[PDB]
Each structure stands twice: as structure tokens, then as C-alpha cells.
């Protein structure tokens, strides 16, 4: 299984593109990253950075995760994120998304050795 840090990578990292170049970027992109291989995942976010850049968020500002958990961290600078939200009924295998390209600060849930983003939580 694609656990914690690898699952973050799978779900989020899109470094090859600096931004959602299309209003339908998420539709295709979601597929290639294994996210929609069985079911069309209702909501997800891509993050247009390297892993190294996002590891850098884990030691900026400590925050609470959306549930209340103490192990989420925010960057002092805005990051290029692409929110992928299902539109017009996301059916398998023709998964249908609405794409948002935004430059917002990110909350990554971090741990491990070396200390790495394991889960993405919120863009603020």
C-alpha cells in the first residue's frame, strides 16, 4: 500500500505543472494519480510544488488540523493549489471535475523521519 507520505504524493503533488492550465485540469489529472482507479473520488486537491517545498511547510507555523489535531502546519507564503471537486456526476471511468487554481497557504499534516507531509488538510 501507498502509505502516509506516498499517499500525500499520490493525492497532491503536481510539480510538472505550476498551475491548473485548464478549467478541466482536475478531470484528467485525478485519473493518472490512481485517485479514481475504482471510484471517482468526490473531493481532492493538487499541489503544484515538489515534495521538498511542502516538507518546508512542516517547520514553518504549527496549527490545528480541521478536526482539531495538533500536527498540521502552515506555510508563511501562499502555494499553488488545484482543488478538484466533482461536478455533473462523477461516474466511473468518466470522472467529471470542477477545477480551481488558487494561490493559498497550505496546511499539511506532517510526521516521520525525515519529517514529511503525510496528509493534506486545508488551503487557507
From Swiss-Prot:
Residues that hold substrate according to the record: 7, 10, 41-45, 66, 85
Protein's cellular compartments: Secreted
Effect of residue 119 to A: Loss of activity
GO MF annotation list: lyase activity; nucleic acid binding; ribonuclease A activity; RNA nuclease activity
GO cellular component: extracellular region
Sugar attachment sites: 1, 7, 34, 37, 41
Disulfide bonds: 26-84, 40-95, 58-110, 65-72
Catalytic reactions of this protein: an [RNA] containing cytidine + H2O = an [RNA]-3'-cytidine-3'-phosphate + a 5'-hydroxy-ribonucleotide-3'-[RNA]; an [RNA] containing uridine + H2O = an [RNA]-3'-uridine-3'-phosphate + a 5'-hydroxy-ribonucleotide-3'-[RNA]
Residue numbers annotated as active site: 12 (proton acceptor), 119 (proton donor)
Tissue: Pancreas.
Keywords, sorted A to Z: Disulfide bond, Endonuclease, Glycation, Glycoprotein, Hydrolase, Lyase, Nuclease, Secreted, Signal
EC number, as in UniProt: 4.6.1.18
Coiled-coil residue windows: none
Domain of life: Eukaryota
GO biological process: defense response to Gram-positive bacterium
Function: Endonuclease that catalyzes the cleavage of RNA on the 3' side of pyrimidine nucleotides. Acts on single-stranded and double-stranded RNA.
Subunit structure: Interacts with and forms tight 1:1 complexes with RNH1. Dimerization of two such complexes may occur. Interaction with RNH1 inhibits this protein. Monomer.
Protein family membership: Belongs to the pancreatic ribonuclease family.
Stated name of the protein: Ribonuclease pancreatic
Taxonomic classification: Eukaryota, Metazoa, Chordata, Craniata, Vertebrata
Amino acid at each position: 500500500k501507498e502509505t502516509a507520505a506516498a499517499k500525500f504524493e499520490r493525492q497532491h503533488m503536481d510539480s510538472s505543472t505550476s498551475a491548473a492550465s485548464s478549467s478541466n485540469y482536475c478531470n484528467q489529472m485525478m485519473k493518472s494519480r490512481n485517485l479514481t482507479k475504482d471510484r471517482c473520488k468526490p473531493v481532492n486537491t493538487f499541489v503544484h510544488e515538489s515534495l521538498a517545498d511542502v516538507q518546508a511547510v512542516c517547520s514553518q507555523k504549527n496549527v490545528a488540523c480541521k478536526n482539531g489535531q495538533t500536527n498540521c502546519y502552515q506555510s508563511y507564503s501562499t502555494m499553488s493549489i488545484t482543488d478538484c471537486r466533482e461536478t455533473g456526476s462523477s461516474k466511473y471511468p468518466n470522472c467529471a471535475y470542477k477545477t480551481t487554481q488558487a494561490n493559498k497557504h497550505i496546511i499539511v499534516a506532517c510526521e516521520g523521519n525525515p519529517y514529511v507531509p503525510v496528509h493534506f488538510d486545508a488551503s487557507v
